[PDB]
Short mmCIF file of C-alpha atoms and ligand atoms in Angstrom, two decimals:
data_model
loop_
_atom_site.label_atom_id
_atom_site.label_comp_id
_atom_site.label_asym_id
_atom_site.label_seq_id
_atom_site.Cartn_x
_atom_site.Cartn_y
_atom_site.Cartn_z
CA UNK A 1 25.65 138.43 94.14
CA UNK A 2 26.39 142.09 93.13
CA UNK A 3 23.14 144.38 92.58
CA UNK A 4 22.57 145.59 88.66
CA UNK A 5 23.27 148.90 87.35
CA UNK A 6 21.75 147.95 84.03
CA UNK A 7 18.71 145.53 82.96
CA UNK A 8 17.48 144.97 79.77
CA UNK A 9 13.53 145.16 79.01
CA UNK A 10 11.81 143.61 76.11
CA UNK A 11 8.57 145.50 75.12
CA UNK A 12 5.90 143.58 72.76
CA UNK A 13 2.76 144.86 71.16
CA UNK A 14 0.98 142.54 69.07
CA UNK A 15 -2.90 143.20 67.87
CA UNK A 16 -4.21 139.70 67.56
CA UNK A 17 -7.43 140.87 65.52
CA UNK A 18 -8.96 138.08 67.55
CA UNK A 19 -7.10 134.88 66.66
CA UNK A 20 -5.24 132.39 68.45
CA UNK A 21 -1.66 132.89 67.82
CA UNK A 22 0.10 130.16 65.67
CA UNK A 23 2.37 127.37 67.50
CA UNK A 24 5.58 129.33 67.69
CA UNK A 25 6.02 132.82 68.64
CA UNK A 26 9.81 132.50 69.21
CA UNK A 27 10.82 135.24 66.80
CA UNK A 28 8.75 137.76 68.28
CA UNK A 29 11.13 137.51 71.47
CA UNK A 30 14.24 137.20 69.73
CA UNK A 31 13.75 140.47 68.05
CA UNK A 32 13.98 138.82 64.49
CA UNK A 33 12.71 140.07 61.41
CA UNK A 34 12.49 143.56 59.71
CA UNK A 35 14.01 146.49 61.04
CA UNK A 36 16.87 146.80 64.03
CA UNK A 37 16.82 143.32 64.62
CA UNK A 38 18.62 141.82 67.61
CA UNK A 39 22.53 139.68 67.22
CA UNK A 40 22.15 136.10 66.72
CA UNK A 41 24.91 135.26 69.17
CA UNK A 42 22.35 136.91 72.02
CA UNK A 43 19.26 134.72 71.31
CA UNK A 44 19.89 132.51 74.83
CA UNK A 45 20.39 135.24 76.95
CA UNK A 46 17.29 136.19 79.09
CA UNK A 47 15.84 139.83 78.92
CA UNK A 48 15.44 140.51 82.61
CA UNK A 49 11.95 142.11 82.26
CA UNK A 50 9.48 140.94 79.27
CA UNK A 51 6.17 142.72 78.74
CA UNK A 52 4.02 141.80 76.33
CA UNK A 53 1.08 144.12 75.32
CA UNK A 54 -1.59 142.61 73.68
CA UNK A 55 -4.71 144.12 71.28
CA UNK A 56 -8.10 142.01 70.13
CA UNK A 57 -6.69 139.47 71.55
CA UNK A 58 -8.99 136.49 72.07
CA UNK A 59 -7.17 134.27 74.98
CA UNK A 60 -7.91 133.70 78.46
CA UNK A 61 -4.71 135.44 80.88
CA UNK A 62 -3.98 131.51 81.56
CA UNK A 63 -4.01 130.59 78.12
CA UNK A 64 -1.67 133.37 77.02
CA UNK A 65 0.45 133.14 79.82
CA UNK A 66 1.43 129.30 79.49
CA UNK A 67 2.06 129.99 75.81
CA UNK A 68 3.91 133.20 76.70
CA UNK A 69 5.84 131.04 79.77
CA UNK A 70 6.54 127.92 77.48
CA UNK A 71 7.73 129.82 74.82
CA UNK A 72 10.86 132.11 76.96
CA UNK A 73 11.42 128.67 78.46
CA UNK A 74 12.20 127.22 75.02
CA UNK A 75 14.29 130.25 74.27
CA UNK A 76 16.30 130.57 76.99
CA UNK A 77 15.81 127.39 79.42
CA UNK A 78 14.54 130.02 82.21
CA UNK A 79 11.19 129.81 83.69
CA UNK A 80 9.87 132.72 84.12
CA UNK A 81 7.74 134.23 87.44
CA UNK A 82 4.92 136.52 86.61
CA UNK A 83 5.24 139.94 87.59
CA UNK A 84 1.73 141.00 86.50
CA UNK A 85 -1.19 140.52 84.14
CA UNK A 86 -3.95 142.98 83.49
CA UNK A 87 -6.88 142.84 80.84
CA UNK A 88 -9.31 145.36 79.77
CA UNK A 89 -12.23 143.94 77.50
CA UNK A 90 -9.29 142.10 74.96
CA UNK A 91 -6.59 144.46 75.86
CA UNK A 92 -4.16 143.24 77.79
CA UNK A 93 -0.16 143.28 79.42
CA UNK A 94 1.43 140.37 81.02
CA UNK A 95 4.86 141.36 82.47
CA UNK A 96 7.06 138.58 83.14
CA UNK A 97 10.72 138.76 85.16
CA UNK A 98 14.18 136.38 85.80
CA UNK A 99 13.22 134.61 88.96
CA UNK A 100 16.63 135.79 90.82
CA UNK A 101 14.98 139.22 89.94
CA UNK A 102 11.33 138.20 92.72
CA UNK A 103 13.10 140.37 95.33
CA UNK A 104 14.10 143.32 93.47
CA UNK A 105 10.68 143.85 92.22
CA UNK A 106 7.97 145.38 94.56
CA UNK A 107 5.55 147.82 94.80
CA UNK A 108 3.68 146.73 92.22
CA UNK A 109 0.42 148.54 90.63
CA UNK A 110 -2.17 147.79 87.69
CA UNK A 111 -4.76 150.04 86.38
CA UNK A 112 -6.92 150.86 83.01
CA UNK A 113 -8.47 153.54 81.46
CA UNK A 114 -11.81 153.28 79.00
CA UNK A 115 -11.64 155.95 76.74
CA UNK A 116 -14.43 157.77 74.72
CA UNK A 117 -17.97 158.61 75.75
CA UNK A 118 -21.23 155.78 75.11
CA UNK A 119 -21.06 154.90 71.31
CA UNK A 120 -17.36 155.20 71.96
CA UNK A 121 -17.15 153.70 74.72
CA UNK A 122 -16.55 150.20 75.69
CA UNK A 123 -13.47 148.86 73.51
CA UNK A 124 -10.19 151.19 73.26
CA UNK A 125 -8.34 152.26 76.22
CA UNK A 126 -5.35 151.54 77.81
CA UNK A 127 -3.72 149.06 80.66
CA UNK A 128 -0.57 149.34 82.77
CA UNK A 129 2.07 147.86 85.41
CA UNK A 130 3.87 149.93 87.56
CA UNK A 131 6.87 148.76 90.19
CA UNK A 132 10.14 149.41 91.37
CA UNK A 133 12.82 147.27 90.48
CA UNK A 134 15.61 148.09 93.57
CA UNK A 135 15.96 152.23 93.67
CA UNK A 136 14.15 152.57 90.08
CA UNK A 137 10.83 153.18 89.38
CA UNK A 138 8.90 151.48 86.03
CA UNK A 139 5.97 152.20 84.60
CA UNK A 140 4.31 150.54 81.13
CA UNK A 141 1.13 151.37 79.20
CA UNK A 142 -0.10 149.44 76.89
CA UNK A 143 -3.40 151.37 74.77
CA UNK A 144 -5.63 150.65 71.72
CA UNK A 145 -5.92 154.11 70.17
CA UNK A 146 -9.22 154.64 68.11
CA UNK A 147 -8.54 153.58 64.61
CA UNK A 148 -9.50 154.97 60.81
CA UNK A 149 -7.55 157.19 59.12
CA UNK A 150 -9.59 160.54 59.57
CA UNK A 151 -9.34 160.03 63.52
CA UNK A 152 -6.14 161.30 64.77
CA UNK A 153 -7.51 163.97 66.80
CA UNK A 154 -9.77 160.99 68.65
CA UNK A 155 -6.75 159.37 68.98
CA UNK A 156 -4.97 162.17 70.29
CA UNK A 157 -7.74 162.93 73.36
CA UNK A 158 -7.87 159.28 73.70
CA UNK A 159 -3.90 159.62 74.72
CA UNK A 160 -4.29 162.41 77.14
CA UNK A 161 -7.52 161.09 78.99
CA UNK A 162 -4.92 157.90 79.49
CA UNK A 163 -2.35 159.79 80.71
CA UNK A 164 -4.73 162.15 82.98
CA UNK A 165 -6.58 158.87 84.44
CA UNK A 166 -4.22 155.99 84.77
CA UNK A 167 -3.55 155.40 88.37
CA UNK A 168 0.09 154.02 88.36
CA UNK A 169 3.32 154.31 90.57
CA UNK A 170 3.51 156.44 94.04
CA UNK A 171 0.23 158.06 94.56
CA UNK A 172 1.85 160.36 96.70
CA UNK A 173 3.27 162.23 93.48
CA UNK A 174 -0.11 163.36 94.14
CA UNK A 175 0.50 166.83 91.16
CA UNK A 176 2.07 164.04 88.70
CA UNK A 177 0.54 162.10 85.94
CA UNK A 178 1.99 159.01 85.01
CA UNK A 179 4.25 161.11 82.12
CA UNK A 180 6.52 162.10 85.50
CA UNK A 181 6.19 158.77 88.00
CA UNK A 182 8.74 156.73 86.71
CA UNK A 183 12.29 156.50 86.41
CA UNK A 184 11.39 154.75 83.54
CA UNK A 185 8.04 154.70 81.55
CA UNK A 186 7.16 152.55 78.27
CA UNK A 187 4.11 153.46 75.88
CA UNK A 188 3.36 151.12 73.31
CA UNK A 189 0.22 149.56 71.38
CA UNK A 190 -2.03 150.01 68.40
CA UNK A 191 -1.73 153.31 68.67
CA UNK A 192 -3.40 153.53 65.39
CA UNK A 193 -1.90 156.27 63.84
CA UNK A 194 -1.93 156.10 59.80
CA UNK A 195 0.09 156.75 56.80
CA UNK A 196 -2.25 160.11 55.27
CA UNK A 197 -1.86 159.96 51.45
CA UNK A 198 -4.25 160.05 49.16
CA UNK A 199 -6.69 156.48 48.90
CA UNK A 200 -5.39 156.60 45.12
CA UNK A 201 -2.06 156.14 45.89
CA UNK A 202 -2.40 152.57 47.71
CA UNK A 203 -0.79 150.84 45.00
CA UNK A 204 2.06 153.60 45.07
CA UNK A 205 2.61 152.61 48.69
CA UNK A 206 2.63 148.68 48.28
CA UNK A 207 5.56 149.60 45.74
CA UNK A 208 7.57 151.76 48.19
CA UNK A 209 7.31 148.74 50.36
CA UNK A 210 8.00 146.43 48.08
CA UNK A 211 11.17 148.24 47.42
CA UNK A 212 11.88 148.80 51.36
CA UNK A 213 11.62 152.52 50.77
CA UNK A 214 10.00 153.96 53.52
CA UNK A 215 10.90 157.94 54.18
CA UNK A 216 7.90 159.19 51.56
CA UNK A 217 5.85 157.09 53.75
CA UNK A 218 7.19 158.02 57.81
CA UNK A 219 7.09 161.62 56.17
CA UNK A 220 3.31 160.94 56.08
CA UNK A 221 2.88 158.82 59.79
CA UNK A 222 0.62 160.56 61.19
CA UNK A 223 2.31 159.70 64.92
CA UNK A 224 5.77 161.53 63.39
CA UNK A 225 3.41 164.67 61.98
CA UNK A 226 1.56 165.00 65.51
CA UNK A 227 4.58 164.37 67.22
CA UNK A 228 6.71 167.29 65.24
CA UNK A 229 3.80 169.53 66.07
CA UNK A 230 3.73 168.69 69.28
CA UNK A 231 -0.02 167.62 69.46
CA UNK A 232 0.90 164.06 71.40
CA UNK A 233 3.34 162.26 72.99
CA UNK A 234 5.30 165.78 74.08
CA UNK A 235 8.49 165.02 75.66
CA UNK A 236 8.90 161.03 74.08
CA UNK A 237 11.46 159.19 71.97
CA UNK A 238 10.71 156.82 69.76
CA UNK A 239 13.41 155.03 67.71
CA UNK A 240 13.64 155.15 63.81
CA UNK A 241 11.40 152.79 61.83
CA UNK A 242 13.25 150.64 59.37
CA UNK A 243 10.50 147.85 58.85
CA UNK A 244 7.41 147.68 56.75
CA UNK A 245 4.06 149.13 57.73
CA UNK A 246 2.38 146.25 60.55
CA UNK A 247 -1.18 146.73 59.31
CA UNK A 248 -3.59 145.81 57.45
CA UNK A 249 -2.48 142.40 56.13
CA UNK A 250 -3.97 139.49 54.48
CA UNK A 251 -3.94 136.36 57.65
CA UNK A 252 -1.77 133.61 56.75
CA UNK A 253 0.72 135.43 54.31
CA UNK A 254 2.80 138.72 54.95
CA UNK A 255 2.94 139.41 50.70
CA UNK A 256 -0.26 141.10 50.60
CA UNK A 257 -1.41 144.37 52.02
CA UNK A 258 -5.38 144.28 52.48
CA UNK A 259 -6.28 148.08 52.20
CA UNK A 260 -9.97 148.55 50.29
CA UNK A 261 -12.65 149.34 51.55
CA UNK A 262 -15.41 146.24 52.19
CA UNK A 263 -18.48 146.05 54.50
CA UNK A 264 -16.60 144.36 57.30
CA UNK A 265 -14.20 147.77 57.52
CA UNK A 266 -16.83 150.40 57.58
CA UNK A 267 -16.47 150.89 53.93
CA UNK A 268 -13.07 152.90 55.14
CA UNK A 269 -9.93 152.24 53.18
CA UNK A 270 -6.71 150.94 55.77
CA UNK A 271 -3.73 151.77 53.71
CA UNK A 272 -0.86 150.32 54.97
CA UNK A 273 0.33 151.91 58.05
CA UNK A 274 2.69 151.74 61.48
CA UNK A 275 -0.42 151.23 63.85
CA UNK A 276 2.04 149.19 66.37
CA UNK A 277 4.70 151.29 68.11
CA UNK A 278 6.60 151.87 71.16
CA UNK A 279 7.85 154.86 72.77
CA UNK A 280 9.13 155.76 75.95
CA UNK A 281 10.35 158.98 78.38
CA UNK A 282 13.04 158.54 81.16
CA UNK A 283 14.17 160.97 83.28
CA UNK A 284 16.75 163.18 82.29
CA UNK A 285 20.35 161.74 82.20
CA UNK A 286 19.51 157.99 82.86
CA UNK A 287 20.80 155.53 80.71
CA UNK A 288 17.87 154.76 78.13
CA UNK A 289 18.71 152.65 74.82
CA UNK A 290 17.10 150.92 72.39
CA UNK A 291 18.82 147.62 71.16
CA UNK A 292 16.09 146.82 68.77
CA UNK A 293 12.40 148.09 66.87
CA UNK A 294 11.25 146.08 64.45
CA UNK A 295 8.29 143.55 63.20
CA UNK A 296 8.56 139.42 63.06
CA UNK A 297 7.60 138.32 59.41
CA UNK A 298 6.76 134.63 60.34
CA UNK A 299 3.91 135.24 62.78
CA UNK A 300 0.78 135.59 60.52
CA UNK A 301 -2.31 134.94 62.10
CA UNK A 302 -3.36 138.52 62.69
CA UNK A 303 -4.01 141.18 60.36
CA UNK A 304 -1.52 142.63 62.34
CA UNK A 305 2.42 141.86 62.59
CA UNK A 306 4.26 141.80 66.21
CA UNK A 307 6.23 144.19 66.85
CA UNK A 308 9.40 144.21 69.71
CA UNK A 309 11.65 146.93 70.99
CA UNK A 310 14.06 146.16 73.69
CA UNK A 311 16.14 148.44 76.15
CA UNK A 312 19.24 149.13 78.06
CA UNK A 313 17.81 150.94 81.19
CA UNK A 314 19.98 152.13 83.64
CA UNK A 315 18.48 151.14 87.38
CA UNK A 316 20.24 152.08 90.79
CA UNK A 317 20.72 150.04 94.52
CA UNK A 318 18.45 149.96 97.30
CA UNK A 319 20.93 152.06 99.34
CA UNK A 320 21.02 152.17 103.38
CA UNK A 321 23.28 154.09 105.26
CA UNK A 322 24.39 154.01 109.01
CA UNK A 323 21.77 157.47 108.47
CA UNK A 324 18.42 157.18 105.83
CA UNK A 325 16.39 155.75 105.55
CA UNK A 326 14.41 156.83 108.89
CA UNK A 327 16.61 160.21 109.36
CA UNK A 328 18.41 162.85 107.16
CA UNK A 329 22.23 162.92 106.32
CA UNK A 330 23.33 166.50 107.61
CA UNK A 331 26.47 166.08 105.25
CA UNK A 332 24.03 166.14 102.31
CA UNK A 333 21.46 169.63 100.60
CA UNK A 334 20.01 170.79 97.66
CA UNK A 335 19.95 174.61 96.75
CA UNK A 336 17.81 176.26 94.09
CA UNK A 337 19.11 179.86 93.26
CA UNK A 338 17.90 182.54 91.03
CA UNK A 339 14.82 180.26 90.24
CA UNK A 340 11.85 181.57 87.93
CA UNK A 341 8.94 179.35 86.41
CA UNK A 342 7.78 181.39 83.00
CA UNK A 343 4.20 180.01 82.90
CA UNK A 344 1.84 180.33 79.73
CA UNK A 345 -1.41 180.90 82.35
CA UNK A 346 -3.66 184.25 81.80
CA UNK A 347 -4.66 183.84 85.73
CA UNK A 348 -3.44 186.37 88.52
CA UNK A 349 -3.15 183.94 91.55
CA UNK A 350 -0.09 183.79 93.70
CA UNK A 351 2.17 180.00 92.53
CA UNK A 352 4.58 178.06 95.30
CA UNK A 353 6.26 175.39 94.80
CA UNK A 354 6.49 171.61 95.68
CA UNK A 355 9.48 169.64 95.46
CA UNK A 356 9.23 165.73 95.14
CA UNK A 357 12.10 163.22 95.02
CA UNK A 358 12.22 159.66 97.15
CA UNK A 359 15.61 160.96 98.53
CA UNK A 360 13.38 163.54 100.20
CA UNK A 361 11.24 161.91 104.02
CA UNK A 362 8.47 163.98 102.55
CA UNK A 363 7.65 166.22 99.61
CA UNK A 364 8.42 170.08 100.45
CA UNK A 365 6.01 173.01 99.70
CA UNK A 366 8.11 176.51 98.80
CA UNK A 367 6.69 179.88 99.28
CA UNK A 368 4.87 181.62 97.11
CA UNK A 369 6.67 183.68 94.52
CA UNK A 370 6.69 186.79 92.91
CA UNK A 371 4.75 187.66 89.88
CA UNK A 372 6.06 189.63 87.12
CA UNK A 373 5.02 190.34 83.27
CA UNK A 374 7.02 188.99 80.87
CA UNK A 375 8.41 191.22 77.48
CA UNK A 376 6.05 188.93 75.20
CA UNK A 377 3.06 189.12 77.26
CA UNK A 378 3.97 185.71 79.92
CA UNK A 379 3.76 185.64 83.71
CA UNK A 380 7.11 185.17 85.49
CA UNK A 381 7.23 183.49 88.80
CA UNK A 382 10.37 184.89 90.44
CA UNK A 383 11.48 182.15 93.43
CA UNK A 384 14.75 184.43 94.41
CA UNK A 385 17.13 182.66 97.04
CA UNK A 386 13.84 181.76 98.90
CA UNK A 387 13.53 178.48 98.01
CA UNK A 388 13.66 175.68 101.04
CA UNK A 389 17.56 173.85 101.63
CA UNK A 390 16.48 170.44 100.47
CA UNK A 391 17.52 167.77 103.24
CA UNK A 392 17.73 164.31 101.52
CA UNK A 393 18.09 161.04 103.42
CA UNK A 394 21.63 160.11 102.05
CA UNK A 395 24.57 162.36 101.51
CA UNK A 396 26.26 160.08 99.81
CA UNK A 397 27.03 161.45 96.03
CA UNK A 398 27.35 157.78 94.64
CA UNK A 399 23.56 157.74 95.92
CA UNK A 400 22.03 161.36 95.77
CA UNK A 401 24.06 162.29 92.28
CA UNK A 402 21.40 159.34 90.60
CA UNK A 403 18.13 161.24 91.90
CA UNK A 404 15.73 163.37 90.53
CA UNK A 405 13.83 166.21 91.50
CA UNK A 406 10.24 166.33 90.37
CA UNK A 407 8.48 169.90 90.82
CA UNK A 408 5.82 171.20 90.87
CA UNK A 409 3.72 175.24 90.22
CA UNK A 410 0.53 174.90 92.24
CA UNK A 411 -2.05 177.78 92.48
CA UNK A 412 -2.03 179.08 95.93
CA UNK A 413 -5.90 180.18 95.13
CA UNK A 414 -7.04 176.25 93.96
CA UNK A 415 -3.69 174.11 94.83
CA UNK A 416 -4.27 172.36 91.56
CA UNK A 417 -0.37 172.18 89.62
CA UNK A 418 -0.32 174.03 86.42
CA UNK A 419 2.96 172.76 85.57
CA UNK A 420 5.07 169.24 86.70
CA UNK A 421 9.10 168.76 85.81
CA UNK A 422 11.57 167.22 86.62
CA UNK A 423 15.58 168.06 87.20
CA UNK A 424 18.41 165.48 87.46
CA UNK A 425 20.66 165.90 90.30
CA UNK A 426 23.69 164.17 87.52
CA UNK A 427 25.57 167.53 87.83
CA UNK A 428 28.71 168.19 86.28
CA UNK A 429 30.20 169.33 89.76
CA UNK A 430 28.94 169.77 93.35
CA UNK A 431 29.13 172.53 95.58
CA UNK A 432 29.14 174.55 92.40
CA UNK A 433 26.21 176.79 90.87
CA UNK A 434 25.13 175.32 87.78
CA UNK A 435 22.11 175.96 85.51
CA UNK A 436 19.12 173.71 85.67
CA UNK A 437 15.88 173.72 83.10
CA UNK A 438 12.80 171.65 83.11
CA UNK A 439 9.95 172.33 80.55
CA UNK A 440 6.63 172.42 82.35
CA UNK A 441 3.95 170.48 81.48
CA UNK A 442 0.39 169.52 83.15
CA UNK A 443 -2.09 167.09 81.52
CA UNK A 444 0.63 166.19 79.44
CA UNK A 445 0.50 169.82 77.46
CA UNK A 446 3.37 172.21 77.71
CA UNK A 447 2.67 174.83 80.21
CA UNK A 448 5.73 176.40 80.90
CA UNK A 449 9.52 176.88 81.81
CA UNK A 450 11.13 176.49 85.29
CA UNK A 451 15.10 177.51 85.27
CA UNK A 452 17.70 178.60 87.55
CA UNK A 453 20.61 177.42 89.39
CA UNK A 454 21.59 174.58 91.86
CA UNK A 455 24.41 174.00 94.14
CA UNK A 456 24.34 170.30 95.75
CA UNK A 457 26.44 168.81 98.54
CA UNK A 458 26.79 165.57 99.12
CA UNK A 459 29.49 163.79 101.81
CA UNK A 460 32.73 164.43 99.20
C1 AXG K 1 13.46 168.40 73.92
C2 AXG K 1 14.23 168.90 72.85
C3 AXG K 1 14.65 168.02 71.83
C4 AXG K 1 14.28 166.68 71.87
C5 AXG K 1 14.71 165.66 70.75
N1 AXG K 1 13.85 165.49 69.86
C6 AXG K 1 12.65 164.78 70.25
C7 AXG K 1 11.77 164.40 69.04
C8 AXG K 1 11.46 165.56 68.23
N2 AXG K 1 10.65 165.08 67.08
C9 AXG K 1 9.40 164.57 67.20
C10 AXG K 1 8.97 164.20 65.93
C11 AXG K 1 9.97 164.48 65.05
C12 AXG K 1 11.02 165.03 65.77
C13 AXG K 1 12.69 166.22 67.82
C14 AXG K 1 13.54 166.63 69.03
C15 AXG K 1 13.51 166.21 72.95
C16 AXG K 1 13.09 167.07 73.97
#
């Protein structure tokens, strides 16, 4: 049986606003219903990877998974094994996988973040599954964003604390966040973000959807305004929206959008908005692509519609050679040349570097650089030809041509990072100087510009 190169991955979110589900769920995991909706002819074949990302939802982890189990079997005659299932207060992800998949997966890691501080602490926050599937890292986060209209700011400190704290993936990335750990990484959830028009113009809005016109509304999502500004979610994709706002409906019905304000809201208006969303961030040049974003418009319990996105994701082999893993490849390095960082820091310390990759034994710390001042007032870290040869394991381009090299700027004052990239060794040629360019970021913030050139040889 021949190892994949590709999987597909079906991503959920569904706020429950505390409600058993109704009978069938089917739709929700055949990607039917408004928006890029998924071919007919595809509904028995098996995602390889399902995870399902759950908000206010009011079920016990058995009770959702036997529904969750029963209802893939029903789909697609496959029973399921369990991957992982984590819950925070009524937050939760379940990630479920093909059986013939149990020996591919390993390394596998769970983790949560509260967010906010006593009066605003103890119900949003965030959960999340980390594991390798062969040679490819994945990570998924699943957060509750704090909700109302006038709190995207909240929301947007409520994303960074998440990505800051959640312990996922190889904590010997030890400079990395979770924004840099995977191959692969999925964010998706009631995010909570709003439609910001005017409370008048509710009944302006219903009749935009009514009429399935959405751009005067996404020109308005606040997630799309932060986004463009860069204020969250730096360095994400998130497919185009061509279904209806999720949120706030009336249960039992999709035809009405509940949006005034009443006691049981706060007395805050909920015009209809795209609260439920999914996003992700691969590494540079793997194969990422969406095959489907949109809402189910049968599933009506919650005030709140499912929505789905699923994925072609690249993933690589295992690989073993007569040489790594447990030795180098002599046949195989990695040179940086004419390598500067341009950093947006107003401190004076001395920078090196460290290089990460798992086709490295270990993680290898560069000399420091030298400082110059930029023309518009920046400090420029100038590496030179002084970087470290990097040694990988395997020489083998059909192997080292599919890594990635994560870096690195650490204070040589503090040795915290003010800056983490990441460069794809998918070069256009080898043994040939070529450019290279990572943005810097740290906390999740743009910090900075590393560039230069690289000349890799592998075995050919
Ligand atoms: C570096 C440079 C360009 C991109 C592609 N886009 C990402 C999304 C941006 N965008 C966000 C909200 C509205 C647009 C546009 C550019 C990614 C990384």
């Amino acid at each position: 049986q021949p190892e994949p190169d590709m999987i597909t991955i079906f991503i959920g979110t569904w706020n429950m606003g505390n409600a058993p589900p109704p009978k069938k769920i089917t739709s929700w995991f055949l990607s039917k219903g408004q928006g890029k909706t998924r071919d007919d002819s595809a509904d028995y074949i098996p995602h390889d990877i399902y995870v399902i990302g759950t908000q206010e939802d009011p079920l016990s982890e058995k009770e959702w998974l036997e529904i969750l189990k029963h209802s893939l079997q029903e789909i697609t005659s496959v029973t399921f094994k369990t991957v992982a299932i984590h819950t925070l207060w009524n937050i939760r992800i379940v990630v479920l996988a093909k059986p013939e998949h149990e020996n591919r997966i390993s390394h596998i890691c769970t983790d949560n973040v509260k967010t906010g501080i006593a009066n605003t602490l103890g119900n949003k926050g965030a959960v999340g599954v980390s594991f390798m599937f062969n040679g490819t890292s994945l990570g998924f986060v699943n957060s509750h964003l704090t909700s109302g209209s006038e709190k995207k700011l909240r929301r947007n400190q409520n994303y960074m604390n998440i990505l800051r704290f959640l312990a996922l993936g190889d904590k010997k990335l030890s400079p990395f966040n979770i924004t840099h750990r995977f191959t692969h990484l999925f964010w998706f959830g009631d995010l909570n973000y709003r439609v910001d028009l005017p409370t008048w113009e509710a009944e302006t809005i219903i009749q935009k959807i009514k009429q399935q016109q959405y751009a005067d509304l996404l020109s308005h999502d606040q997630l799309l305004t932060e986004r463009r500004e860069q204020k969250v979610f730096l360095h994400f994709e998130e497919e185009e929206i061509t279904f209806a706002p999720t949120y706030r409906f009336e249960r039992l019905t999709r035809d009405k959008y509940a949006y005034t304000k009443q006691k049981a809201t706060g007395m805050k208006y909920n015009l209809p908005s795209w609260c439920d969303r999914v996003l992700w961030k691969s590494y540079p040049l793997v194969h990422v692509v969406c095959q489907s974003y949109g809402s189910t418009s049968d599933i009506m319990t919650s005030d709140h519609s499912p929505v789905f996105a699923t994925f072609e994701a690249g993933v690589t082999s295992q690989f073993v050679s007569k040489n790594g893993p447990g030795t180098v490849d002599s046949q195989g390095q990695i040179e940086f040349l004419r390598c500067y960082a341009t950093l947006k820091t107003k401190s004076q310390t001395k920078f090196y570097l460290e290089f990460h990759s798992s086709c490295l034994e270990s993680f290898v710390k560069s000399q420091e650089g030298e400082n110059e001042e930029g023309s518009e007032g920046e400090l420029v870290v100038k590496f030179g030809e002084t970087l470290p040869k990097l040694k990988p394991i395997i020489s083998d381009p059909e192997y080292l041509l599919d890594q990635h090299i994560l870096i690195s700027i650490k204070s040589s004052d503090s040795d915290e990072s003010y800056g983490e990239g990441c460069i794809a060794l998918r070069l256009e040629a080898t043994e040939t100087q070529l450019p290279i360019y990572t943005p810097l970021t740290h906390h999740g913030e743009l910090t900075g510009h590393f560039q230069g050139e690289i000349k890799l040889q592998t075995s050919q």
